[PDB]
Symmetry: C2
C-alpha cells in the first residue's frame, strides 16, 4: 500500500513493460491515463477497456 | 493507451496480483493510492517508494 500525492503527470511501471500516468489535473472529472500491454495478466473494468481497449468485447464474442 | 475518467475510487490490476486505486477526489492535491506487490518487475519514483515502500532514511512526524 503506497499512497503518493499526484496531480500533474505521474509515471509508474508495474509488470514488465507498462506505463500508467495518473494525470490528476482536470476540470470536474479527472481523465486518468493507464498505458498497459495486453501481454501480462491485466484485469480492469469491463466498460473501461470495452470502449478504450477493445470496441465492445464482453465475456464471450 | 487507455484514457478513462476517474474521481472516486478506481481499481485496476496489472501483472498477476496487484491493485491500484486512483482516488481522484481530494482537496488541492490528489492522494493517489498504488497497491502493488514487490514480486513482479515494478519500477517507480525513487522518493515515492523511498518514503512509502522502503524507508530510505527517516521522516519527522
Amino acid at each position: 500500500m503506497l499512497i503518493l500525492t499526484r496531480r500533474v503527470g505521474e509515471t509508474l511501471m508495474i509488470g514488465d513493460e507498462v506505463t500508467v500516468t495518473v494525470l490528476g489535473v482536470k476540470g470536474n472529472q479527472v481523465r486518468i491515463g493507464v498505458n498497459a500491454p495486453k501481454e501480462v495478466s491485466v484485469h480492469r473494468e469491463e466498460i473501461y477497456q470495452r470502449i478504450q481497449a477493445e470496441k465492445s468485447q464482453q465475456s464471450s464474442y
